[PDB]
Design a protein around this nucleic acid. Structure first.
Lengths: 394, 130, 64, 97, 353, 64, 97
RNA sequence: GGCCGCAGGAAGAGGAACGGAGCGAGUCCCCGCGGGCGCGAUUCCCUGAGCUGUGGGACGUGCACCCAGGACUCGCUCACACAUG
């Protein structure tokens, strides 16, 4: 009874009691790159956090927009370059890019990266894309089975040429017939394909292969890599309105539904959690060495693209893994990965390299003239240092 | 058919005209089409309401996406113009003397049909807020 | 513009050329509304989207 | 005395109790000083800015009229002008970075 | 019977404690604190507040003066001024709860007022549109005081609503949700200018002060006097314990950080909140965020600023979780238990040896 | 003064100018009783609020 | 605070007893206010106008420098700038028609 | 993708009390606060069309209000705390 509960609240003593059972976390509902943080393999727990950055979702609105993107539903009049120019003007921001050029009359998924998220545009431009178009055949066909058989034939690695240049190869992974209309000679097709596949050219080839001839009536992109048309997709009106609401009502709520942090694009990748001291080193173009690894995900392989993250869940850089998961767990030293693309700004985290034990030892020996000015050995070096210290420059 | 059209309706399509008010509005539009008093489509209605015209703005309750015409209700309230949603887009275009559907039309007054216009205007002005 | 759609039970778009669903109701147009950068009706769109509880902020929050 | 030049302050909306309410339309959304003299484009003083109200980027102002002026005189969408030195930038009222 | 209660029905800051992230479950309990609801009546009042329904004649500083005569306390604060003729929700903090006044004064308010229009309008819809116009961040001139002209300033109105309109008297009820320091008298003047007819605020009542409202736990000045009388003459606490509430009720919105009994007194002396003393910590702690630090008995130790996020707390094994903003609890409520831990013992041992 | 109210079915105050609610009952004044610090009728108010079971101590205890 | 813009006041001539004498080169031969703040083109205040002297159409001015400034710092024909509102027109000082 | 130019680095990743609290003062911020309360006598007057009897006023008289916070700066006190498996 509501009143019985109220009576117990004032009568009987409450206490968070001591227990002997092991403390088990649940990180399955944590946002973005902190999701299943518990499930990462732990190398060490011992470090000093710095309190400089932020959780990607809870950045201040300025920093949130600068490190963010929009899964835009592109409208049907303007070019892709014009659309991102509008978004640049609306948000009052310096730089913008996109995940693949859609033609003026084509709509759909256009991942518009903003400012410091524009460092991901090459990765988004190379990602696999899905389309839903309408092929309009010039003459009549026996039935929709023939147009399906043409799409079955053009599933695979194809020859293609641009619209009005050299011959190019473009793979179409999957193709499908949604429906066909014999009256107006229009057929909806869906295709999954690699980046830079020309769908205008595909419609012409469908026309030639059938024998009737054809062209592309209209086109829409339903997927752009990780983002889809049912995943947080937003319109140009929303982008304009969300900015306006922030300007006139001081309400960030709408912007934070429109814009998402760049870390949402990288959720598929395997994670490597770095120590806060190592973060700014990597931003300046250092090697990702073993002393700064706190945690590392299961199933990292050699030459695999990994995301390197802070303890707060910010993406530092995209990187190529040189060590396997099993090697990271057992080795004493070495280079864990090398940088592919630095995402995070310089001096987001402070500059905290050369303060370590072994780094300070090397600085001391250079000051003593035991090593040369460029940190290289001499005849006078101890055999302990000369044998143990595996210089990675080699 | 009128009750069936409520299944197709839009989130912002209120105040919706009644079955009888819908019938009266179509006939006022048809009379205004003959005298060439109406203005059809968003581009024209938006232009003329901004320019300074007055009348009754009939909106279509089947319109999607809402972003095409959801600015118009407030454009009316700035200038105290009456507006109302009718059930269908296709019926509005047929009544407006178009072979395509239309999302919005503005009917202006005229000496030829003031009796029908006044019956609609007063009933539309009387409509309750949602 | 010929491309239409209706939502599946799963929640995703089922594309179609027809103007009605299998279950009778009208299909929506696949393409978004036309936009122009000179638009000065942000106040207007927000004002009524608030009234009918269809503004993007007032919906259930997404899963991240 | 009369200023060297005057910049567009705003346009006439309805009168309200023997002073005139006006929609502010300044370049860069600048905000007038309190009791700043309001002029017509002929550089004749009609009154002074009394109230400033509304949203930051769409604000209004009332004008306490001069001794000789009447609120009935002004027409709809008639423009009013201000000495550009007793304007302030909008950034001042926006929050500190 | 506490065993039967779900953790969602535990009082104040211990509500839903099982959904906090558990760092460690082991600590040594100490017989020092009480649950905030079971504090001895003296201590209960000194750490408490009143959700007052202010009467319509006196100023807000007179009302809190009257409260500090009645309860016989030295300090009070009041969650934002109500003007002499205005009524409604006035959170009156007593003694050690006066440390929270800035958080209460800065919180979002709600008002229900009456605007009187000086001429007729078309109807209730016209007033309703003028209220929609004065939503969002507005210019408002702060009134003159001691001949000191304060500059024009910005205040947000989150929501507005036109509740009723009477065309006979030209009276309109409005409800406004707004930022702290918004002038509602000024709003009614502007609402009159915008309509063109003119206007004044006839009447006003504050229906919400941040966390507290008129919906629940609100009491009148008679209850305050009456409850004290019953305690003075019959030695009955029952009435006072329904008038006054513990300051923990003001902090239920904040993110929590539960500490071991060993750490409590250290933090009260001005030590930074270190990670080895954290038992439990809430989801959604961010850097530079104001958090409440509590005991295992649900008492507020201090308002602290978090220097680690939730995720960072999960990964680390030592270091500064948070720095103090303002200490609530008195020194020596709990005993001194600092310097006894393994690493701190090793440090002192290795200095001596 | 002018503000009155009546309670809805979920116990929320519904403000109004009119002296009667939609069910014909009288509306209460929104404002509390005027207070004096020199009030000496504390005994008297407790005495009959106990008698009619409407003293604050006799009500259902609030859930915190 | 710092003004929105600044207009050319004049150019540096010789220093004189720890303040700087400057030839006035304003558009329309405008005259500065007494104790009007003098800025460099970076909108940093170097001093204030102390004296104004010479012929009407070819006049000079001295600048009483700021706390941190020194008269040795400035080079020959270095330009100085003023807030355009504390200029006055030459017509004011010319005789009445 | 490649080539050229410029700029920042030439990085092995440190630190289990760092450098705190509570008061007091000065200066800013906050800051619509002569009004509020009581009693007395000609029922002290008054259902005013003047707010108003759930209160308004006159004359005696007394009484209690005009803070509490935050920030900066210069003191006093208490600590200088990694939280006892």
């Amino acid at each position: 009874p509501e009143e019985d509960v109220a009576e117990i609240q004032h009568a009987e003593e409450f206490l968070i009691k001591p227990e002997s059972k092991v403390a088990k976390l649940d990180t399955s509902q944590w946002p973005l790159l902190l999701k299943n943080f518990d499930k990462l393999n732990v190398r060490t727990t011992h470090y000093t956090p710095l309190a400089c950055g932020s959780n990607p979702l809870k950045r201040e609105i300025g920093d949130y927009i600068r490190t963010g993107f929009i899964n835009l539903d592109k409208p049907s009049n303007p070019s892709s370059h014009e659309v991102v120019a509008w978004i640049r003007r609306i948000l009052r921001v310096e730089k913008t890019g996109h995940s693949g050029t859609l033609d003026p009359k084509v709509t759909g998924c256009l991942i518009v990266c903003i400012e410091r998220a524009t460092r991901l545009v090459k990765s988004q431009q190379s990602a696999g894309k899905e389309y839903v178009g309408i092929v309009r055949l010039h003459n009549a066909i026996e039935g929709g089975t023939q147009l399906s058989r043409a799409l079955e034939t053009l599933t695979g690695a194809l020859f293609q040429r641009p619209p009005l240049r050299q011959l190019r190869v473009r793979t179409i992974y999957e193709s499908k017939m949604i429906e066909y209309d014999p009256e107006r000679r229009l057929g909806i097709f869906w295709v999954s394909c690699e980046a830079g596949t020309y769908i205008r050219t595909l419609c012409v080839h469908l026309g030639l292969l059938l024998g009737v001839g054809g062209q592309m009536q209209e086109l829409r992109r339903v997927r752009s890599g990780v983002m889809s048309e049912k995943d947080h997709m937003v319109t140009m009106h929303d982008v304009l309105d969300a900015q306006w609401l922030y300007d006139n009502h001081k309400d960030e709520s709408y912007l934070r539904r429109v814009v998402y942090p760049l870390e949402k694009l990288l959720t598929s990748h395997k994670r490597l959690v770095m120590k806060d001291s190592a973060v700014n080193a990597i931003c300046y173009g250092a090697k990702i060495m073993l002393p700064g690894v706190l945690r590392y995900e299961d199933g990292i392989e050699v030459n695999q693209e990994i995301v390197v993250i802070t303890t707060k869940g910010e993406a530092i850089c995209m990187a190529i893994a040189l060590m396997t998961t099993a090697v990271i767990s057992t080795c004493d030293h070495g280079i864990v990965a090398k940088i592919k693309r630095v995402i995070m700004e310089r001096d987001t985290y402070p500059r905290k390299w050369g303060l370590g034990p072994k780094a300070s030892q090397k600085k001391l020996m250079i000051k003593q003239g035991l090593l040369d000015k460029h940190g290289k050995p001499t005849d006078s070096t101890p055999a302990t240092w000369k044998q143990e210290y595996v210089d990675y420059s080699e | 058919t009128y009750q069936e059209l409520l299944v197709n309706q839009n989130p912002i399509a209120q105040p919706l005209a009644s079955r009888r008010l819908t019938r009266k509005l179509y006939k006022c539009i048809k009379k205004a089409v003959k005298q060439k008093q109406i203005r059809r489509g968003v581009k024209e209605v938006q232009k003329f309401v901004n320019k300074g015209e007055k009348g009754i703005m009939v909106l279509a309750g089947d319109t999607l996406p809402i972003e095409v015409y959801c600015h118009l209700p407030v454009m009316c309230e700035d200038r105290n113009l009456p507006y109302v949603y009718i059930p269908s887009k296709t019926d509005l275009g047929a009544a407006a003397g178009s072979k395509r559907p239309t999302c919005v039309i503005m009917v202006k007054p005229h000496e030829e049909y003031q009796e029908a216009y006044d019956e609609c205007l007063e009933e539309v002005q009387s409509l309750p807020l949602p | 513009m010929f491309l239409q759609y209706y939502l599946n039970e799963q929640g995703d778009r089922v594309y179609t050329l027809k103007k009605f669903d299998p279950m009778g109701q009208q299909t929506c147009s696949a393409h978004p509304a036309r936009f122009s950068p000179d638009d000065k009706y942000s106040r207007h769109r927000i004002t009524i989207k608030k009234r009918f509880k269809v503004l993007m902020t007032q919906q259930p929050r997404p899963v991240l | 005395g009369p200023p060297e030049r005057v910049v567009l302050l705003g346009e006439f909306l309805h009168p309200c109790e023997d002073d005139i309410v006006c929609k502010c339309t300044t370049d860069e959304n600048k905000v007038p000083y309190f009791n700043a003299p309001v002029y017509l484009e002929n550089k004749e003083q009609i009154g002074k800015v009394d109230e400033i109200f509304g949203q930051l980027r769409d604000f209004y102002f009332s004008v306490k009229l001069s001794e000789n002026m009447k609120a009935s005189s002004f027409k709809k969408l008639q423009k009013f002008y201000i000495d550009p030195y007793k304007l302030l930038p909008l950034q001042r009222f926006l929050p500190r970075p």
